[PDB]
Amino acid sequence: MTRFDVLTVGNAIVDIISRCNDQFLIDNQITKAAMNLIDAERAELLYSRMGPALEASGGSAGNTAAGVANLGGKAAYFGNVAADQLGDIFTHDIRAQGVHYQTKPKGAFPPTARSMIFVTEDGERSMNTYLGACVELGPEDVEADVVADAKVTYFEGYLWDPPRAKEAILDCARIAHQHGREMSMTLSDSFCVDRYRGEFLDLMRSGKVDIVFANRQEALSLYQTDDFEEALNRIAADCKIAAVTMSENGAVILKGRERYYVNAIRIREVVDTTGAGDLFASGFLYGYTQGRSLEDCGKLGCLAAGIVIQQIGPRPMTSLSEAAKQAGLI
Amino acid sequence: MTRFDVLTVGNAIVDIISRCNDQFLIDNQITKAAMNLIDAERAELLYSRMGPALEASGGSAGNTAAGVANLGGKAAYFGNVAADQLGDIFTHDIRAQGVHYQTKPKGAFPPTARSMIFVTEDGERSMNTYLGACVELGPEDVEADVVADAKVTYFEGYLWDPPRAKEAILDCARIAHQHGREMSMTLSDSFCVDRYRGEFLDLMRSGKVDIVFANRQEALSLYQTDDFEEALNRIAADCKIAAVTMSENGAVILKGRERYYVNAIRIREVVDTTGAGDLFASGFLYGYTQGRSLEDCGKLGCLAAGIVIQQIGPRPMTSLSEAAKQAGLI
Ligand SMILES: Nc1ncnc2c1ncn2[C@@H]1O[C@H](CO)[C@@H](O)[C@H]1O
Ligand SMILES: Nc1ncnc2c1ncn2[C@@H]1O[C@H](CO)[C@@H](O)[C@H]1O
Ligand SMILES: CCOC(=O)c1ccc(N)c(N)c1
Ligand SMILES: [K+]
Ligand SMILES: [K+]
């Protein structure tokens, strides 16, 4: 009997969300559909140009933990905020969803990370992230008893950007595996992959990462190929289990020579794609820690992903567990 | 020609929004559909029990100014925040809508006001407001040049709660009337009216308030009657122009013996009633300052109101001016 099903580790972020036209992206040299890192000066500049906005707790892994909790699984989260109002919001939202969150702020500066997310008419999201207090996450924030007591520890590729987070993750890897648990990562973003390609591959090939999440872009980038079939064969060879999403075309789960294809739910309208990948991981990891088939994990992933893209905000405001019961996924 | 069509004055507040069941209201002794004032200790308590939330810039008058700006009118706002992150959010959202907002924060403490708004399945909103830095708004925040140059200065009844706001308002009344402009107020909330009945009536009868906004509940409370026909006759006798909203039953505008009845627009679904009255006033005051007839002012009000209640958040995220152009109201 174990304390947690899923522990996630990520950049703790509050989203600042606004709708824009595509000319806004071009005028501001914002790479569309991507995570764009920005300094404090650029953050002020972009905000000055941003329309009236809504705020909502974010962070890829934070969203994923929240999604596991919503579904009914037992979640935990590691991520550093500042001792400020944005930090208080982040802390409230994740804890109120029923996720264990005990990471202590280190001070007020740097302030709590934020991401200005611009949503275009097509529902695509373009993120502009000032990492703030995220740069302070290190080994000192690893709650060893939590990693030891979690079926899966899952982390973002995004953590390779701040300086010392990777050290926390290696510490996590070691504790998890010594306790016979498994480690999971998402590739996060195609440019993030570009930046850390060798390191990500090393994590997979050394056995420090057991299950890998990727979308089509991330997979294509990982192997710098335009051949998706090549990407699928290579990713299968590089990790024990790979879950590869393909947006409206659904997902394929890979294990050794096994492939399991899952359909995407049919959408009324794409509101905002923010959190689709995160919530796919929520459903997959919930199913996975409940002992479900790799196909059923895929199904749960697509269900959670499908729900999150039909609302504003990265964390489902409706009941995932209820949705899963209605869908016969239970 | 003048710089401003509408100046509004109010409690500068950021909303913290969550959906709840009706048992939540009962267990926490929250008065349904009402503005519930709370201290710092109660705010912490309620937040600790609140679910994952979304933040959005609020304040009744704030929403109203932003709504006038959305429709194409020239707006200005007086309201006091603190020098903190919530205050920076408030300052951003109202300015980015093209509202003149120059009220200077006095420090970091008390912090920026916030209201925890719980939305029930029926779409009703129950607000729980800590006034924070709002208690510091006073005559010193009256930008005399703005009042002098605004066609209408509009204020909340809610302003009678903080200690010195009423002094700013009397200064606005004097300046507005001496420059040949009009003063407007909203009765805000039925319990607010209970609290300040004598003072509100005196504002109306002395000529400091020319145009009054009320919903059915507020009108009945103003005269402590369950006879709505009595309320309409009495309100028409106490102010020059009365705009009385009746939710799904639309509105009635009253001027002397004239009555102009307006229908509510067709609604897909009542998502969240937060801002309905605020945006009615936006539509009304936009028409009014554009020389439109009282009936067409009603119509523009009902349109702006009808749009706001079909979304989460108190400020329409879509173009009101475009909606009005499509609506044949121009
Ligand atoms: N650098 C980053 N690291 C982790 N998460 C991020 C980063 N930038 C944006 N996000 C989060 O990604 C989520 C969508 O997947 C958003 O909620 C946003 O907060
Ligand atoms: N005491 C108050 N004074 C002014 N506005 C308020 C108060 N409490 C809540 N509000 C605002 O009322 C709006 C809905 O009319 C919400 O956006 C909320 O911010
Ligand atoms: C409900 C939020 O309020 C506070 O935390 C708070 C209020 C007043 C103060 N002076 C301080 N320091 C904090
Ligand atoms: K979304
Ligand atoms: K609303």
Residue B180 is part of a domain; what is its CATH number? 3.40.1190.20
* A86/B84 Cβ within 8 A: no
The CB of A115 under 6 Å from ligand 1? The reply is yes
Residue A274 Cα, ligand 4 centroid: separation in angstroms?
4
B35 forms beta bridges with B127
Q: Name the token pair of A52.
A: 């009236």
Residue A68 corresponds to which amino acid? Answer: V
CA nearest ligand 1 atom 12, residue: A60
Burial class (CB in 10 A: 0-12, 13-18, 19+), B29: exposed
Binding site residue list of A for ADP: 215, 245, 247, 250, 277, 302
Residue A312 corresponds to which amino acid? Answer: I
User: CA–CA separation, B89 vs A16, rounded Å?
Assistant: 10
The CB of B136 under 6 Å from ligand 3? The reply is no
The number of angstroms, rounded, from the C-alpha of B26 to the middle of its chain's C-alpha atoms is 26
* A97/B315 Cβ within 8 A: no
User: CA–CA separation, B192 vs B204, rounded Å?
Assistant: 16
User: CA–CA separation, A104 vs A113, rounded Å?
Assistant: 15
> How close A228 comes to chain B (CA, Å)?
38
Q: Return the number of other C-beta atoms located less than 10 Å from residue B92's C-beta.
A: 19
* B85/A111 Cβ within 8 A: yes
List C-alpha distances in Å: B231 to A92, A126, B249, B283.
44, 52, 16, 23
B:53-72 residues touching chain A, CB 8 A cutoff: 53-57, 66
Domain that holds residue B6: 2-330
Q: Name the token pair of A83.
A: 């001792």
* A53/B93 Cβ within 8 A: yes
User: CA–CA separation, B86 vs B134, rounded Å?
Assistant: 13
Q: Name the token pair of A275.
A: 């959190």
Q: Return the number of other C-beta atoms located less than 10 Å from residue B202's C-beta.
A: 13
The b-or-e profile of A61-73 (16+ CB within 10 A means b, else e) is bbbbbbbbbbbbb
The CB of B109 under 6 Å from ligand 3? The reply is yes
Residue A135 corresponds to which amino acid? Answer: V
The CB of B87 under 6 Å from ligand 3? The reply is no
Helix (H, G, I), strand (E, B) or coil at B22: helix
Residue B259 Cα, ligand 4 centroid: separation in angstroms?
45
List C-alpha distances in Å: A257 to A200, A240, A294, B93, B282.
22, 10, 13, 53, 63
Helix (H, G, I), strand (E, B) or coil at B125: strand
Q: A100 and chain B: CB distance < 8 Å anywhere?
A: no
Alpha carbon dihedral A282, A287, A289, A294, in 10-degree steps, equals -110
Please name which of A242, A257, A255 lies closest in space to residue A301, comparing C-alpha atoms.
A242
What would you report as the CA-atom Rg of chain A, rounded to the nearest whole angstrom? 18
User: CA–CA separation, A44 vs A116, rounded Å?
Assistant: 10
Residue B104 is classified by DSSP as P
Q: Name the token pair of B139.
A: 């005559």
Q: Give residue for tokens 């951003």.
A: B92
The CB of B261 under 6 Å from ligand 3? The reply is no
Determination approach: X-ray
**Both ends of chain B: CA-CA distance in Å?**
21
Three-state secondary structure readout of chain A: CCCEEEEEECCCEEEEEEECCHHHHHHCCCCCCCEEECCHHHHHHHHHHCCCCEEEECCHHHHHHHHHHHHCCCEEEECCCCCCHHHHHHHHHHHHCCCEECCCCCCCCCCCEEEEEEECCCCCEEEEEECHHHHHCCHHHCCHHHHHCEEEEEEEHHHHCCCCHHHHHHHHHHHHHHCCCEEEEECCCHHHHHHHHHHHHHHHHCCCCCEEEEEHHHHHHHCCCCCHHHHHHHHHHHCCEEEEECHHHCEEEEECCEEEEECCCCCCCCCCCCCHHHHHHHHHHHHHHCCCCHHHHHHHHHHHHHHHCCCCCCCCCCCHHHHHHHCCCC
Total tally of structural domains belonging to chain A: 1
List C-alpha distances in Å: A7 to A22, A81, A282.
37, 17, 11
Q: Give the H/E segment covering residue B137.
A: none
Q: Give residue for tokens 């890829």.
A: A60
Q: A114 and chain B: CB distance < 8 Å anywhere?
A: no
Q: Name the token pair of A197.
A: 């390609």
Who contacts B244 (Cβ-Cβ below 8 Å, separation ≥6)? B213, B214, B215, B216, B219, B231, B232, B235, B251, B252, B253, B254
Do the Cβ atoms of B217 and B224 come closer than 8 Å? Answer: no
* E-assigned strand segments in B98-195: 100-101, 113-119, 125-130, 150-156, 182-186
Q: Name the token pair of A111.
A: 């302030």
Who contacts A233 (Cβ-Cβ below 8 Å, separation ≥6)? none
Q: A113 and chain B: CB distance < 8 Å anywhere?
A: no
CA nearest ligand 3 atom 7, residue: B110
Residue B114 is classified by DSSP as E
Q: Give residue for tokens 């008419």.
A: A121
Strands of A211-215's sheet, edge to edge?
Answer: A100-101, A75-78, A4-9, A150-156, A182-186, A211-215, A241-245, A251-255, A258-262
Q: Name the token pair of A286.
A: 């919930």
Please name which of B33, B3, B2 lies closest in space to residue B270, comparing C-alpha atoms.
B33
User: CA–CA separation, A184 vs A155, rounded Å?
Assistant: 6
Please name which of B150, B152, B170, B151 lies closest in space to residue B160, comparing C-alpha atoms.
B170
Do the Cβ atoms of B89 and B62 come closer than 8 Å? Answer: no
Do the Cβ atoms of A119 and A272 come closer than 8 Å? Answer: yes
